[PDB]
């Protein structure tokens, strides 16, 4: 009953099971630990970062090793459009003979790989199960490096100080230039040297790379300035990927669009992209001042940025010390940027597939988009939660105020009511009218008169599609016109490739849109606005409100303030995160439902099914869920089973976890404490069991813990059931 | 970089004078015990108790390897594979083309014998109050003192004799595995070569 929460003496003195539960959930909140200083905080965070990167590299190495050992990578190379990639083998003693037979792939039961790693590794120039093994070996070596570094930087003479950790200019210069630019430069080097010849049949391994010229002229044009030579003779339109037939000699080109065979971006396009990004980031990494008297001091930049007329208060004067001294502000900024970035990855890796033969891998396309959108929602909610935490525990009004006037951040708490009221107005506006149009379509179609539907053509979005060259909406605007200056400017660089790809019905590049797209985009906007409303309200109201003008004194996460003053359930800022998680899950569900149904109709060919039935709710319920759930639920029946049996089991498992979350959310404490007391009496008053007694007094889960557990069940069930549905439906419908 | 100190003066390494002399074995033992208590206090890790137990097991296993070689040579060690219909799909190793290669029955029998011996060990582990030599160290008990580079030359059924023979057997197993890995033959093939041919005859 002691010594487990070593970091908290208050918990270690708890005589109940709450100590164990809270010991888990407070282990990473280093700022709240006993005998805590800032130096130890930054050092522990640094070591934890090292361990985390080691974990990531070990996970990647495991994926590589299992593809190399139990996969069919080599067979998939020779026939990427017919051979289904294998993730890893299965050894489960609970299998019957039927399950073994159904999951049997080649030599052993195995799982199909939906991560798209086969296409990614094939694109970057891997052709052998020994290339994957080398990658796994190297990644385990890197993990060992990172673990050694993490141990080393906790040693006495190697523990960095607060000044080093808060040295913003040095870290920015190095991160930008070194990390981004130099990693892009090295990736361009690999892309060219290995990937470009490997796509043309020439093997460039760790033996013949110092003697195989990536370009026939060989670094002469680069120093000579004849950089056009690297773009001459690109890959033709009859080039077979991985073979020298119809190949070229160029390494950096503009082509635009996709490879005619793999239906993916040109490797020479991506090498040029990464070279440009490398140059730009290396240049941008010299901005801030270091030991050589030139550069920028960001404190001065922030302080000097006050509009002269005066509408942002005193400007950004106090922001430097605010951000530097708070790890939650930086964490929130990083999480918001990462969420936007992974939303970008999801939205671009389906419209512009970058890996060979990934466009025809429909289950992996759906899985990748869903995975990245869910990660995006999680990251955004985390960014807002950490902003709220910064408000609660790191924000100092004195730093952000100069002689009564407030800086740009402190002024966000002055018109907080205006911000929240207008977020509420936008959410109500969008919800009222999107639901009104959807229900109008529902009722009108149900009454057998679909012509009375309200169908709004998304002209604004179709205008953008025409601006990028789509000649489908008869707009003749910028790139849909051959005479506009936008078209004449790039008529010789990348329009022929771009136009040939955007004006193609088999791509996902700028999918044609209609009224259903309009309505679902408005639903998405409503979801985004409502999630933002909850999170922003929790962040701004974190320090106090009218119901609790001292909420900052109770911390970020506390159960309530009691039944007084009318009742104060879910009044903390943590509860705002807890409520906004449901809205994030709902919004990501809407986004992924829209994406998956649109792409299922596109792949099956019945795009008229979406364009007609997507305007009313029953259309969704009947033609997406009810229609495509048939293959999934018949993964095992009283007659047999298929390789989709695991997905049906996961479907039911997700439903069960969802409803257990419903348990933990609807039923609150107090009802579970008295029942536990009855159980305690029963155990204490029964023979043959009195010999065994608990060391920690069994008590009901706390209010905040119960909310967390219900949210965890809700989210896990949500994710599992939707992953099972999307994967099984795609597999069982599209062969 | 220049206007500040990367490492504070208050956080600097101090040379541990407590390990002066203290040959690498004593230094390693002290470092392990200080760094990992509650597993060192149990006798686990680089400890004389663990060394003695592992030596006993290595000697018994040299005996077991000789017995296994004899059984393989003398027509024992049942033939074929396990019945998947009888023992489920967990005994299936691979399916090449329409035939299920299962775990060899000889491997199953050897695993059952090893299970017998390991069960005996587990009973002795959860029988601490009735066994002559316990597996772990009692709280308070102190680990027997390391024997050193060369244990005392005391012939017979002595602690030093068992210690020396356990070290020799463990080194022999290490050498056997190293020879098998370097040259590439089976473990029993290496034992057969190292016995002239008198085992697999």
């Amino acid at each position: 009953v002691y010594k487990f929460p070593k970091f908290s003496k208050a918990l270690a003195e708890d005589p109940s099971t709450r100590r164990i539960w809270y010991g888990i959930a407070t282990a990473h909140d280093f700022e709240s630990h006993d005998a805590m200083t800032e130096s130890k905080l930054y050092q522990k965070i640094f070591a934890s970062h090292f361990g985390h990167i080691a974990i990531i590299f070990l996970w990647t190495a495991g994926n590589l090793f299992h593809v190399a050992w139990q996969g069919n990578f080599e067979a998939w190379i020779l026939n990427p459009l017919k051979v289904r990639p294998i993730a890893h083998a299965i050894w489960d003693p609970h299998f019957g003979q039927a399950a073994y037979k159904a999951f049997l792939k080649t030599s052993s039961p195995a799982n199909l790989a939906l991560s798209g790693v086969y296409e990614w590794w094939y694109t970057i120039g891997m052709r052998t199960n020994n290339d994957l093994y080398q990658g796994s070996f190297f990644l385990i070596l890197l993990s060992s490096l990172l673990l050694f570094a993490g141990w080393l930087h906790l040693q006495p003479s190697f523990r960095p100080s607060l000044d080093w950790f808060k040295a913003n200019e040095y870290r920015l210069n190095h991160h930008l230039s070194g990390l981004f630019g130099v990693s892009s430069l090295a990736w361009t080097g690999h892309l060219v040297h290995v990937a470009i010849p490997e796509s043309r049949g020439i093997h460039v391994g760790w033996d013949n790379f110092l003697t195989v010229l990536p370009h026939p002229e060989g670094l002469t044009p680069f120093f000579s300035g004849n950089w056009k030579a690297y773009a001459q003779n690109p890959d033709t339109a009859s080039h077979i990927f991985g073979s020298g037939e119809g190949s070229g000699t160029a390494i950096l080109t503009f082509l635009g669009g996709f490879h005619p065979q793999t239906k993916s971006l040109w490797l020479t396009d991506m090498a040029h992209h990464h070279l440009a990004i490398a140059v730009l980031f290396i240049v941008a990494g010299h901005m801030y001042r270091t030991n050589w008297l030139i550069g920028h001091q960001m404190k001065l930049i922030l302080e000097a940025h006050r509009p002269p007329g005066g509408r942002l208060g005193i400007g950004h004067i106090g922001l430097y010390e605010t951000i530097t001294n708070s790890l939650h502000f930086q964490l929130g900024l990083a999480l918001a940027a990462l969420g936007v970035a992974t939303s970008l990855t999801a939205q671009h890796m389906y419209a512009l597939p970058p890996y060979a033969f990934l466009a025809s891998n429909f289950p992996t396309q759906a899985a990748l988009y869903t995975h990245h959108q869910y990660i995006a929602g999680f990251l955004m909610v985390g960014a807002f939660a950490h902003g709220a935490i910064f408000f609660v525990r790191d924000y100092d009004p004195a730093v952000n105020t100069r002689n009564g006037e407030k800086n740009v951040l402190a002024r966000m708490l002055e018109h907080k009511e205006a911000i929240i009221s207008h977020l509420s107005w936008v959410s109500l506006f969008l919800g009222f009218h999107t639901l009104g149009i959807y229900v109008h379509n529902d009722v009108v179609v149900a009454f057998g008169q679909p012509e009375k539907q309200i169908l709004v053509e998304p002209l604004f979005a179709e205008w953008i599609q025409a601006a990028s060259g789509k000649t489908l909406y008869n707009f003749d605007l910028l790139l849909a016109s051959s005479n506009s200056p936008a078209s004449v400017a790039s008529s010789q660089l990348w329009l022929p490739g771009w136009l040939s790809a955007i004006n193609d019905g088999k791509n996902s590049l700028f999918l044609p849109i209609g009224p259903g797209d309009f309505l679902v985009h408005h639903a998405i906007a409503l979801g985004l606005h409502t999630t933002t409303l909850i999170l922003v309200k929790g962040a701004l109201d974190a320090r106090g409100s009218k119901l609790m003008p001292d909420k900052k004194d109770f911390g970020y996460s506390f159960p309530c303030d009691g039944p007084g003053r009318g009742g104060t359930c879910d009044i903390s800022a943590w509860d705002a995160f807890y409520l906004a998680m449901f809205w994030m899950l709902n919004t990501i569900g809407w986004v992924t439902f829209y994406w998956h149904w649109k792409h299922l109709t596109l792949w099956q060919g019945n795009q008229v099914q979406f364009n007609e039935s997507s305007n009313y709710i029953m259309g969704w319920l009947r033609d997406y869920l009810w229609l495509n759930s048939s293959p999934l639920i018949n993964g095992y029946n009283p007659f047999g089973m298929n390789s989709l049996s695991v997905w049906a089991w996961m479907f039911l498992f997700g439903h069960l976890v969802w409803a257990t979350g419903f348990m933990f959310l609807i039923s609150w404490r107090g009802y579970w404490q008295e029942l536990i007391e009855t159980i305690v009496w029963a155990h204490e008053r029964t023979p043959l069991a009195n010999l065994v007694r608990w060391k920690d007094k069994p008590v009901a889960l706390s209010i905040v813990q119960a909310r967390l557990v219900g949210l965890a069940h809700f989210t896990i069930g949500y994710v599992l059931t939707y992953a099972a549905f999307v994967i099984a439906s795609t597999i069982g419908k599209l062969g | 970089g220049t206007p500040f100190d990367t490492v504070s003066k208050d956080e600097l390494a101090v040379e541990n004078k407590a390990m002066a002399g203290k040959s690498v074995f004593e230094r390693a033992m002290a470092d392990f015990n200080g760094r990992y208590p509650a597993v060192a206090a149990l006798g686990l890790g680089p400890s004389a108790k663990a060394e003695r137990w592992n030596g006993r097991h290595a000697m018994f296993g040299w005996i077991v390897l000789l017995a296994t070689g004899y059984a393989q040579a003398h027509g024992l060690l049942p033939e074929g594979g396990m019945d998947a219909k009888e023992w489920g799909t967990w005994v299936i190793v691979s399916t090449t083309n329409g035939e299920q290669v299962t775990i060899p029955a000889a491997r199953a029998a050897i695993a059952i014998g090893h299970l017998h011996f390991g069960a005996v060990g587990v009973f002795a582990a959860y029988s601490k109050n009735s066994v002559k030599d316990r597996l772990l160290l009692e709280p308070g008990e102190k680990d027997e003192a390391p024997a050193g580079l060369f244990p005392a030359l005391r012939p017979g059924l002595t602690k030093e004799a068992e210690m020396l023979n356990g070290r020799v057997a463990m080194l022999g197993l290490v050498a056997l595995v190293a020879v098998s890995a370097a040259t590439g033959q089976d473990i029993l093939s290496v034992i057969d070569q190292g016995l002239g041919g008198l085992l697999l005859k």
């Binding site: 010594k3 070593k6 522990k44 070591a47 934890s48 090292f50 361990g51 080691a54 070990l58 090793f65 190399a68 050992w69 199960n129 020994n130 093994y133 796994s136 070996f137 385990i140 070596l141 993990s143 060992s144 673990l147 050694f148 993490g150 141990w151 906790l154 | 760094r35 990992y36 890995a181």
Partner: peptide, 30 residues
């Protein structure tokens, strides 16, 4: 198909990465 030697040495290297992980884990304290 990878050999027994390839998998074995990868397992051995994985063990070394494990001992480095507990050293980091124990250094981040109990």
């Amino acid at each position: 198909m990878i050999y027994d030697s390839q998998v074995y040495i990868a397992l051995v290297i994985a063990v070394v990465a494990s001992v480095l992980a507990i050293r980091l884990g124990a250094t981040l304290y109990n």
